[PDB]
Design an enzyme around this catalytic site. Sequence first.
Site, mmCIF file in Angstrom:
data_model
loop_
_atom_site.group_PDB
_atom_site.id
_atom_site.type_symbol
_atom_site.label_atom_id
_atom_site.label_comp_id
_atom_site.label_asym_id
_atom_site.label_seq_id
_atom_site.Cartn_x
_atom_site.Cartn_y
_atom_site.Cartn_z
ATOM 1 N N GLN A 256 62.763 37.989 33.032
ATOM 2 C CA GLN A 256 61.897 36.965 33.695
ATOM 3 C C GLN A 256 62.653 36.312 34.840
ATOM 4 O OE1 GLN A 256 58.410 36.104 33.263
ATOM 5 N NE2 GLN A 256 58.459 38.096 32.235
ATOM 6 N N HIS B 124 41.830 38.877 33.984
ATOM 7 C CA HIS B 124 42.771 38.992 35.138
ATOM 8 C C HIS B 124 42.018 39.014 36.466
ATOM 9 C CE1 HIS B 124 46.244 40.217 37.473
ATOM 10 N NE2 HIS B 124 45.600 41.341 37.830
ATOM 11 N N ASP C 284 47.802 37.998 42.752
ATOM 12 C CA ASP C 284 47.952 38.952 41.648
ATOM 13 C C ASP C 284 48.990 38.440 40.655
ATOM 14 O OD1 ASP C 284 47.271 41.267 40.247
ATOM 15 O OD2 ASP C 284 48.654 42.480 41.512
ATOM 16 N N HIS D 183 40.174 44.315 42.208
ATOM 17 C CA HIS D 183 41.467 44.918 42.630
ATOM 18 C C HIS D 183 42.071 45.777 41.504
ATOM 19 C CE1 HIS D 183 43.366 41.763 40.397
ATOM 20 N NE2 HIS D 183 44.519 42.391 40.532
ATOM 21 N N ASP D 184 41.616 45.635 40.266
ATOM 22 C CA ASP D 184 42.208 46.438 39.135
ATOM 23 C C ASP D 184 41.093 47.159 38.341
ATOM 24 O OD1 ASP D 184 45.118 46.296 39.202
ATOM 25 O OD2 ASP D 184 44.983 44.323 38.190
ATOM 26 N N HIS E 298 45.451 43.809 32.040
ATOM 27 C CA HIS E 298 44.673 44.304 33.212
ATOM 28 C C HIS E 298 43.181 44.440 32.919
ATOM 29 C CE1 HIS E 298 48.725 45.514 34.673
ATOM 30 N NE2 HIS E 298 48.211 44.959 35.770
#
Length: 313
Positions: A269, A72, A217, A106-107, A68
Amino acid sequence: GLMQFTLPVRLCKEIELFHFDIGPFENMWPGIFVYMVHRSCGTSCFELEKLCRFIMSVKKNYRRVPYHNWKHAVTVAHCMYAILQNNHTLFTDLERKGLLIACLCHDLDHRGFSNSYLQKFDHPLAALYSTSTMEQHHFSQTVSILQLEGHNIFSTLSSSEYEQVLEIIRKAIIATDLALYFGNRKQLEEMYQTGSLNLNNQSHRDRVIGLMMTACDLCSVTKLWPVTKLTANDIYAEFWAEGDEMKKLGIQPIPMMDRDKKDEVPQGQLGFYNAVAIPCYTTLTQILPPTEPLLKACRDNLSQWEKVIRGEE
Ligand SMILES: Cn1ncc(C(=O)N2CCC2)c1C(=O)NCCc1nc2ccccc2n1C
Ligand SMILES: [Mg+2]
Ligand SMILES: [Zn+2]
């Protein structure tokens, strides 16, 4: 004014594709973003000086965490760039402006910990924001940086256009809270199928931008397999640190976050591609057909995780 950003040839061609990787040279990422704003939005959207100062304050407010992080931010903005460029006529002038910025922001000030960990730690942010804790924080950090002197990239918008763009960014950032994605996508599924989906309906545009935010995202699953696989290592480096912190609070973490359950990653996953990713890109492709390459890339990576389980790697 007559001052274009240009990239080397390989990047000038590949940046247009959904599976583009922005590369290991951090110093080129600001230039890559400005390039995307210029072609997505125009050379007039933002005052270069203000835009560059905004970008550098945004970078400074991302932390040195494994996943993050600033890479990213730029990666999620590039995926948005690719969606916007393949759907030229579907979005307003304000949306094109807002959504690349929302993605970059956004982060903001992420620490590498989930909403759940903040709530169990009893972090101050969890008393200030009871749901979507980190996402309300990221929007808060976005408004802060927009109010620094010389950082108001929206200064030429009118009072009501400014309110509209900050509202696009808010909803877009809140939508990156994956807890909210499941219902947003079910509602989009029913609307598309019963034929009630209406892009002149603001509440419908909101939901569709929300799904775009989720798609951008999660876009590590839409890359070429070696990118996807090496990104997964960064994701688990954060998850396992959180698992370690859960065990410091006297709480068995979920297996996704327990480094002692590494063997279960390949099956986790598959669950994730099947429960989250594939459904995301499927509904996105139904609403916005030219985003199909994201679904195709995701399905290719699911099949690569299937090969990992079969010990073919
Ligand atoms: C690739 N990608 N992009 C985003 C995410 C993601 O989840 N988030 C929240 C922050 C971003 C992932 C991902 O890899 N998630 C891991 C899934 C997963 N691994 C498991 C291992 C053992 C048991 C269960 C497991 N599940 C559900
Ligand atoms: Mg987030
Ligand atoms: Zn994110």
